[PDB]
Design a binder for this molecule. Structure first.
Ligand SMILES: [Mg+2]
Length: 221
């Protein structure tokens, strides 16, 4: 049986993209740029802070100095940190808490494999820290997803080889990282987005210890 489960944060444990939205909306409003609404915020899924800021400046065909651009990106981060004070256990996706409990009670290791620079804070706000055996520090990984580095780090941090692990992800880049680490991917989403060659569930309520065990056994033959 698998010995560890390696979780991304955004799209699996919780949605952080909503707080990123509030932070950008606040910045846009402060600098007098209209049009940062929920629809626009879809154009920011998977997008860097720097690329996101440029898309916001583009709403007003606005050109800024490199120093001002840096300062605006900093202010957005300051805003995001304020916004996420409101994260709570209500933010936890369906099925996830019961999964974490069941993994823990069965002595299956639990690690976070997220690019989030706020991962530990966000797990604490959601009252989940006590379930995690490790959090892979994204500041210590050389290469981001789709590179397998973060998943390899998460597995190692709980004393397992990735080959002993399942990885849960909602993004194509993250599924590729799981694959290339040697861990078994189980995606949440659609094959159109994630790939046609892995097991996928439609939402996180399907991530049960029973289902994971079934998939693991089905994939060992
Ligand atoms: Mg994700």
């Amino acid at each position: 049986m698998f010995k560890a489960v390696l979780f991304d944060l955004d799209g699996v444990i919780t949605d952080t993209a909503e707080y990123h939205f509030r932070a950008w909306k606040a910045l846009a409003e402060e600098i007098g740029i209209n049009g940062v609404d929920r629809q626009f915020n879809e154009q920011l899924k998977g997008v860097s802070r720097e690329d996101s800021l440029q898309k916001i400046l583009d709403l007003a065909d606005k050109k800024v100095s490199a120093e001002e651009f840096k300062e605006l990106a900093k202010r957005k981060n300051d805003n995001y940190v304020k916004m996420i004070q409101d994260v709570s256990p209500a933010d936890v996706y369906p099925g996830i808490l019961q999964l974490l409990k069941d993994l823990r009670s069965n002595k299956i290791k639990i690690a976070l494999a997220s690019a989030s620079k706020n991962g530990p804070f966000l797990l604490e706000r959601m009252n989940l820290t006590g379930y995690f055996d490790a959090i892979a520090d994204p500041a210590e990984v050389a290469a981001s997803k789709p590179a397998p580095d973060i998943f390899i780090a998460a597995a190692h941090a709980v004393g397992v080889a990735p080959s002993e692990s399942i990885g849960l992800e909602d993004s194509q880049a993250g599924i590729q990282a799981i694959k290339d680490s040697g861990a078994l991917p189980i995606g949440v989403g659609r094959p159109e987005d994630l790939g046609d060659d892995i097991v996928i569930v439609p939402d996180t309520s399907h991530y049960t210890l029973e289902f994971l065990k079934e998939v693991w056994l089905q994939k060992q033959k």
